[PDB]
Design a protein around this ligand. Structure first.
Ligand SMILES: O=CCCCC[C@@H]1SC[C@@H]2NC(=O)N[C@@H]21
Lengths: 657, 489
C-alpha cells in the first residue's frame, strides 16, 4: 500500500506494516529527499516541486503514480487531500481501494450544512433552545426560565461569535436582547434572535468511534481537547476526570447508533461540549482519521490503523466492545516551532543543529530526524510526545521528566509553555476549561519563576559541572580536588552564594556552604560537553541541560528555561565590581546593504510592521542569493528599492523609523 | 590591608599584580626581581626612586605547565621603559629560550622614558632583537590592557598573537597631536587606534575581550592548546568523545541549488569535538574562518571558506589571515585541516591597485612550504587558481577527499563555452553550457586524473579524518637546505 501523507502518520503507517507484513511505498517532494519516511519506505517516487500544490496535492501525479507499485490498496492518509471525492472518484476510475470511508457518509456528514438535519434526524440531544424568533421580551424571559440556561443569545443570521451575549438573569436577558438587536440590525440586516442553552464553562469532550464494513461496531473511549490556542489544541487526555458510566455508556451506544445511521465506514470521531452537569451534544462530528488516538491506543491497545486497513478488504474487526477496558490514562502534547515568549514568532528554515528525543518509557511520533528542516509552506510541528500512565500524578510526572530530556538545538520551540502549563497547580487540580489559556495568560506569555531550593540546586549542579570540566584540562596527577566558588546569577551579582566542592569520586561530590560546614554528598552524572545532566540528591531527581560557556558564565537550562550562572572564585568576585559595564548602541534607524549586489526578491511591504528575525529581501551577487533580515524592531517608515535595482553600494534599502 | 590600590580601582581599572594573580594558578607565582632602581641622575630624577621599577616579572604555572610572564605598571612613571626595565624582560626571554617555555606579556606602557635619553631606544632594540630571534622557537602571546603608543608598538607586532581589551585600550605609532599639526584633522585617540579599528580595519589585533576577567579566563583556554616549545610534541588531552559518534546531519547541509548559500560552521562543528573551537580574528575578513580545534583529543588547525559572506571569494585580507595562520601552525608541528569552497578571486580595479598578485601568493607559499600532515575536503566547488592555492593534492598534500556533488573545473561553464566556440551559431548557450557543466563540472574527471583520493559520503568525514590523522602521526619531511626562504612580502 502507498500512503498519501508526509508527516509522522506516514512513518506510523510504514511501521504498522512491520507486524502486518505489508510492503509499503512512500512518495515525496524534491525538498523531502532526506525525510525519514523516504528511507523507512520500501519504495519512493518523486512528486515534483515541494510547493504544496505540486507536492502530494497534485492528484494527477499521485493517481498516475499509482500504477507501478502493484499494491492492491493505497492509504489515503489523514492530511492533504485525504478522504476526498475528486480523489475517491479518480481512484475508482482506475478501480483501486481507498482504505477509507464511503463517499455518501463523507459528504453527508463532513458537509457544513445538513449536519444539523442528521443531528435532528434522531435528535441525539442536539443544541437545545427555543427554535424560532423571540419577538417579545416576555418570550425571551419565559424561554430562559424554561431551562434556566445562560441564554446563549445568538443571531439567526450571524456567525463566528458576532451578535452573542451571555445572559444569567431576566434583567440581563432584557438588556442583552436590547444590545443584540441593535448590533445585529446594523451588522447583518436581521433582527431575528434565538435563545439556546449556553454552557457555563466548556470542556470540549470528544468521543472516539470505530466501525466496520461488515459489523461488530465498537465505541472507543472518549478523549479531551479542552486546551486550545487560536482554535488549535495542545494537550489531550482520553479518560477525562468528569467521567460517569451513566453518561459514558450511553455516549458509546449513541455513537454506535449514529454510526449505522449514515452507514459510516471509517469513523472519524464525535465532538461534544460538556458542562459540570454532565450533558452531551453530538455535532461538529469528524470524518477524518484523528491522530490523537495514540492516547486511546495507550488506554486500550486498539490499533486503529490495522483495524481500518483490515476493514478496507471487507472483513470485520478483531475487537468488540466487550473486551475494551481502561488500564490507566495517557497524556499527549504537540511540539511546535512557534516561539511563544517572542509573540508567537515562527522560526523556519533551520535544520536541527542536533537533537535527541526522550525515550524513557515514553512514546514519540515524529517525522523530523537529525539534520532535518522545516519549510514555511508546511506544518511546523516537530514531535508528538505522548506518555503512558495510570494515574494523573504518575502520568504527569513522567511528562514533566520527559520534557526536560528532549534536546532540541537549531531553532526555537514551545516546550517552555508546555512545561509551565503542566506544572501549574490549576492543571493538577483536576478540571480545566477551554478558555483556560488566555485566562491564565492575560498579557502575552510569561514563564513562572524558580523557588529558593530549585535555584540553590541549580547553583550546586553548576559548581559540580564547573569542577568536573576543570579537572579535564589538567595534566596527569597535578590536579586539584577542592575549591570555594561564589555563584551569582544576573549582571549585578544578585545573591552571592558561597559554595564548596570536593569531588570524592568520578561522579560524587561533597557540596557544602563553605569550608568547615556540613556536607551533603549529592551526585551528578554528565559527559563532558554534552547536554543532559542527571542529578539525584536523596530521592529527588532532576535533569538539567548544558548549553555553553565562556569560562566565567555558564549557560545552563532549568525547567526548560535558559539562564546564565556566574561561577567565579574569591578574587574574581571581589574584582568584578570594579569593571566597566558599557551599554551597546540602541539605534532604531535605516538599515544598509553590507555589500554591492542585485535585489531580486523582496519580502516586506513599505511602512508596515516588522518583527525580529523576519527576512526582508534578497540580494544576488556573483551567483549567490543572500538574505539580510530584520535583527530587531517594531515598525518601519521608508521607500522600497524596486526589483532588479543593480545599484547597492551600501545604499539605504530599508529605513527603520 | 588594601593600601595604595584604592586610587587605581576608583577609575574602574585593575592592577598589574591583580592581573598576574588572575592569570596563573592560585599559589604558583614566584616574582623574580622586585628591588631595582632606575639610577638615572638627570632632570631632577635623582629622587623618587621606586622599588619595583614599574615591571612585574615572574614564572608562574598554568594548568600544571610552566610559563613566563611580565606586566607593565601604569601607576609608576606611566609604565615607561628604560635601560633598567628592559634588562628584566631580556633576562626572562633568554631564560625562556634556554628552557622550552613560552612567554606572555601584558602591555600597558605609556611610551618611552624621556629622562633616560637614548637608553630607552637601546632597551627597545634589545627587546626587538630577542623577539626576532626567538620567533618560531617559543610561542609568544601579547595582550594590551591600556595605552600603547610610540615605538613600543612594534614588539607586540612581531609576537604571534595580539589581543585587545575593549573599553580602555588603544595602540598606534603616532599620536593625534602630530596628526593635527601636519594634516589639520582632529581625531580622538579611540577614533584613531581603538580596539574596533584594529579588529576590523587594520587586521592587527587577533581578538577583543569585554573585560580583563574574561580576558584571563579565555587566555588560559587558549594556552591549553599550544605546545610548550619548538621541539616538544603536540599536546593530547583525555576526552570522552569518540570517533564513532554518529554524524548523519552532514548529508543535508549542502543545498541542491547551486545559487543558495549556507553556513560552513554547520560542516565544521560536527567533525571536531564538542565545544572545542577557538576562532581567531572573528570580525575581520569574514569570508574565511581560522582557529584552533581538537580532533580526538589532539589540537589541530582549521581553515575553511564561507559562502555566507561574499560567496566565499578569496581576497587580500583573507590571504594574509590564512597565510599567517598556516605559517604559525606549521612552525610548531600542528596538523592542518581545510574545507574548500571557492569560485575564484574577487574582481575589481581596487584589487590590482592594491596588489592582489603579492598578497594572494602568500597563502600559496604558506601552503606549499608546509610539512605538517594536511587533510583537505572539497565540499562543493573549486575553480581556477583558487583550487591550486587551497592545499591541492599536488602541493605534497597527504590525503584529499571530495563530496559526491562537488565540482572541479578550470572556470565557470559560460567562459569555457565562450572560449571553445568563437562565432558558433547563436542560441549556443542552451545546448552547450548545460552539456559542458554536465560532462566536466563534476568530480568524476578529477577523480579519473587522480587528484582526489576517493569520493565519500558526507557522513564518513569524522571517521576518515580521525583515521588519517592517527596514521599520519609520525611523518618526517624536510625541505632543501636554506638559510631562510624569500616569501613575497
Ligand atoms: O559571469 C560573469 C561574472 C561571473 C563571476 C563569477 C565569480 S565572481 C568572482 C570570481 N571571478 C570569476 O571570474 N568568477 C568568480
Amino acid at each position: 500500500v502507498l500512503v498519501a501523507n508526509r508527516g509522522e502518520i506516514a512513518c506510523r503507517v510504514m511501521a504498522t506494516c512491520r507486524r502486518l507484513g505489508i510492503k509499503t511505498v512512500a512518495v515525496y517532494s524534491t525538498a523531502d529527499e532526506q525525510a525519514k519516511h523516504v528511507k523507512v519506505a520500501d519504495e519512493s517516487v518523486c512528486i515534483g516541486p515541494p510547493a504544496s500544490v505540486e507536492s502530494y496535492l497534485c492528484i494527477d501525479k499521485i493517481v498516475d503514480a499509482c500504477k507501478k507499485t502493484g499494491a492492491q490498496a493505497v492509504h489515503p492518509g489523514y492530511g492533504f487531500l485525504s478522504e476526498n471525492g475528486e480523489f475517491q472518484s479518480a481512484l475508482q476510475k482506475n478501480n483501486i481501494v481507498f482504505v477509507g470511508p464511503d463517499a455518501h457518509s463523507i459528504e453527508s456528514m463532513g458537509d457544513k450544512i445538513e449536519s444539523k438535519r442528521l443531528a435532528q434526524r434522531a435528535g441525539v440531544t442536539c443544541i437545545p433552545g427555543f427554535i424560532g424568533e423571540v419577538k417579545t421580551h416576555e418570550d425571551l424571559l419565559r424561554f430562559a426560565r424554561e431551562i434556566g440556561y445562560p441564554v446563549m443569545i445568538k443571531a439567526s443570521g450571524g456567525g463566528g461569535g458576532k451578535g452573542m451575549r451571555v445572559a444569567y438573569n431576566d434583567t440581563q436577558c432584557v438588556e442583552y436582547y436590547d444590545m443584540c438587536r441593535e448590533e445585529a440590525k446594523a451588522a447583518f440586516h436581521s433582527d431575528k434572535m434565538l435563545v439556546e442553552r449556553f454552557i457555563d464553562h466548556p470542556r470540549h469532550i470528544e468521543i472516539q468511534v470505530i466501525a466496520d464494513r461488515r459489523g461488530n461496531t465498537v465505541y472507543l473511549p472518549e478523549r479531551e481537547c479542552s486546551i486550545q490556542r487560536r482554535n488549535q489544541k495542545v494537550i489531550e487526555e482520553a479518560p477525562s476526570v468528569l467521567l460517569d458510566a451513566t453518561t459514558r455508556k450511553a455516549m458509546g451506544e449513541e455513537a454506535v447508533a449514529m454510526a449505522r445511521a449514515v452507514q459510516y465506514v471509517s469513523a472519524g470521531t464525535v465532538e461534544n461540549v460538556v458542562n459540570p452537569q454532565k450533558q452531551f451534544y453530538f455535532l461538529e462530528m469528524n470524518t477524518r482519521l484523528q491522530v490523537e488516538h495514540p492516547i486511546t491506543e495507550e488506554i486500550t491497545g486498539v490499533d486503529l490503523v490495522e483495524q481500518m486497513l483490515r476493514a478496507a478488504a471487507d472483513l470485520p474487526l478483531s475487537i468488540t466492545q466487550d473486551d475494551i477496558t481502561i488500564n490507566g490514562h495517557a497524556t499527549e502534547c504537540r511540539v511546535y516551532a512557534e516561539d511563544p515568549m517572542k509573540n508567537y514568532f515562527p522560526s523556519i528554515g533551520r535544520l536541527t543543529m542536533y537533537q535527541e528525543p526522550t525515550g524513557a518509557g515514553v512514546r514519540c511520533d515524529s517525522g523530523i530526524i537529525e539534520g532535518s528542516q522545516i519549510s514555511v509552506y508546511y506544518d511546523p510541528l516537530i514531535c508528538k510526545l505522548s506518555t503512558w500512565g495510570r494515574d494523573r500524578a504518575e502520568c504527569i510526572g513522567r511528562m514533566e521528566k520527559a520534557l526536560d530530556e528532549y534536546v532540541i538545538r537549531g531553532l526555537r520551540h514551545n516546550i517552555c509553555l508546555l512545561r509551565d502549563v503542566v506544572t501549574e497547580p490549576r492543571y493538577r487540580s483536576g478540571s480545566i476549561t477551554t478558555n483556560y489559556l488566555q485566562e491564565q495568560y492575560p498579557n502575552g506569555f510569561k514563564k513562572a519563576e524558580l523557588t529558593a531550593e530549585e535555584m540553590q540546586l541549580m547553583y550546586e549542579v553548576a559548581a559540580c559541572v564547573h569542577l568536573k570540566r576543570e579537572r579535564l584540562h589538567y595534566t596527569q596527577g597535578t590536579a586539584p580536588s577542592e575549591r570555594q566558588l561564589y555563584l551569582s546569577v544576573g549582571a549585578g551579582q544578585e545573591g552571592e552564594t558561597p559554595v564548596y566542592v570536593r569531588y570524592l569520586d568520578d561522579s560524587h561530590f561533597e557540596i557544602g556552604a563553605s569550608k568547615h560546614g556540613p556536607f551533603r554528598k549529592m551526585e551528578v552524572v554528565w559527559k563532558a560537553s554534552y547536554p543532559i545532566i542527571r542529578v539525584k540528591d536523596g530521592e529527588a531527581e532532576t535533569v538539567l541541560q548544558f548549553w555553553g560557556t565562556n569560562e566565567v558564565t555558564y549557560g545552563m537550562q532549568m525547567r526548560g528555561t535558559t539562564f546564565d550562572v556566574n561561577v567565579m572564585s574569591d578574587l574574581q568576585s571581589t574584582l568584578a565590581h570594579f569593571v566597566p559595564i558599557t551599554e551597546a548602541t540602541t539605534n532604531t534607524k535605516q538599515i544598509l546593504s553590507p555589500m554591492p549586489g542585485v535585489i531580486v526578491a523582496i519580502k516586506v511591504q513599505p511602512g508596515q510592521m516588522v518583527v525580529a528575525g523576519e527576512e526582508l529581501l534578497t540580494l544576488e551577487a556573483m551567483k549567490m542569493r543572500n538574505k539580510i533580515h530584520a535583527q530587531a524592531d517594531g515598525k518601519v517608515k521608508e521607500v522600497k528599492v524596486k526589483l532588479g535595482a543593480t545599484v547597492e553600494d551600501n545604499e539605504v534599502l530599508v529605513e527603520l523609523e | 590591608p588594601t593600601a595604595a590600590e584604592d586610587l587605581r580601582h576608583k577609575k574602574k581599572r585593575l592592577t598589574a599584580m591583580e592581573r598576574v594573580q588572575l592569570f596563573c594558578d592560585p599559589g604558583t607565582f614566584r616574582e623574580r626581581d622586585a628591588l631595582v632602581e632606575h639610577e638615572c641622575h638627570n632632570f631632577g630624577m635623582e629622587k623618587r626612586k621606586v622599588p619595583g621599577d614599574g615591571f612585574i616579572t615572574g614564572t608562574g604555572k598554568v594548568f600544571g605547565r610552566p610559563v613566563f610572564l611580565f606586566s607593565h605598571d601604569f601607576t609608576v612613571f606611566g609604565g615607561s621603559l628604560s635601560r633598567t626595565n628592559a634588562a628584566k624582560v631580556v633576562r626572562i626571554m633568554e631564560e625562556a629560550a634556554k628552557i622550552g617555555v613560552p612567554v606572555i606579556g601584558f602591555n600597558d606602557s605609556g611610551g618611552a622614558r624621556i629622562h633616560e635619553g637614548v637608553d630607552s631606544l637601546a632597551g627597545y632594540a634589545d627587546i626587538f632583537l630577542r623577539n626576532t630571534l626567538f620567533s618560531g622557537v617559543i610561542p609568544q602571546i601579547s595582550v594590551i590592557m591600556g595605552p600603547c603608543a610610540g615605538g613600543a608598538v612594534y614588539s607586540p607586532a612581531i609576537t604571534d598573537f595580539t589581543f585587545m581589551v575593549e573599553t580602555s585600550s588603544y595602540m598606534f605609532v603616532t599620536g593625534p597631536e602630530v596628526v593635527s599639526a601636519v594634516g589639520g584633522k582632529l581625531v580622538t585617540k579611540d577614533e584613531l587606534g581603538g580596539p574596533h579599528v584594529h579588529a576590523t580595519k587594520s587586521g592587527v589585533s587577533a581578538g577583543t575581550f569585554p573585560n580583563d576577567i574574561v580576558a584571563m579566563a579565555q587566555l588560559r583556554r587558549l594556552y591549553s592548546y599550544l605546545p610548550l616549545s619548538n621541539r616538544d610534541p603536540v599536546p593530547v588531552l583525555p576526552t570522552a568523545d569518540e570517533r564513532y559518534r554518529d554524524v548523519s546531519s552532514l548529508n543535508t547541509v549542502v543545498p541542491t541549488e547551486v545559487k543558495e548559500a549556507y553556513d560552513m560552521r554547520d560542516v565544521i562543528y560536527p567533525v571536531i569535538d564538542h565545544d572545542s573551537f577557538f576562532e581567531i580574528q572573528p570580525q575581520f575578513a569574514k569570508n574565511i574562518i581560522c582557529g584552533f580545534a581538537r580532533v580526538e583529543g589532539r589540537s589541530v588547525c582549521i581553515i575553511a571558506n564561507q559562502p555566507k559572506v561574499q560567496a566565499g571569494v578569496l581576497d587580500i585580507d583573507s590571504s594574509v589571515k590564512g597565510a599567517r595562520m598556516v605559517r604559525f601552525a606549521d612552525a610548531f608541528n600542528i596538523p592542518i585541516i581545510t574545507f574548500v569552497d571557492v569560485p575564484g578571486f574577487l574582481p575589481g580595479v581596487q584589487q590590482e591597485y592594491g596588489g592582489i598578485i603579492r598578497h594572494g601568493a602568500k597563502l600559496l607559499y604558506a601552503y606549499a612550504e608546509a610539512t605538517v600532515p594536511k587533510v583537505t575536503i572539497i565540499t562543493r566547488k573549486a575553480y581556477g587558481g583558487a583550487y591550486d592555492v587551497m592545499s591541492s593534492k599536488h602541493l605534497r598534500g597527504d590525503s584529499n577527499y571530495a563530496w559526491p556533488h562537488a565540482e572541479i573545473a578550470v572556470m565557470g561553464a559560460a567562459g569555457a563555452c565562450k572560449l571553445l566556440y568563437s562565432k558558433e551559431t547563436a542560441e549556443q548557450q542552451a545546448q552547450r553550457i548545460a552539456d559542458y557543466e554536465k560532462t566536466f563540472c563534476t568530480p568524476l574527471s578529477a577523480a579519473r586524473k587522480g587528484f582526489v583520493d576517493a569520493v565519500i559520503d558526507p557522513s564518513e568525514t569524522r571517521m576518515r579524518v580521525c583515521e588519517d590523522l592517527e596514521r599520519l602521526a609520525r611523518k618526517q619531511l624536510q625541505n632543501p637546505w636554506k638559510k631562510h626562504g624569500n616569501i613575497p612580502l
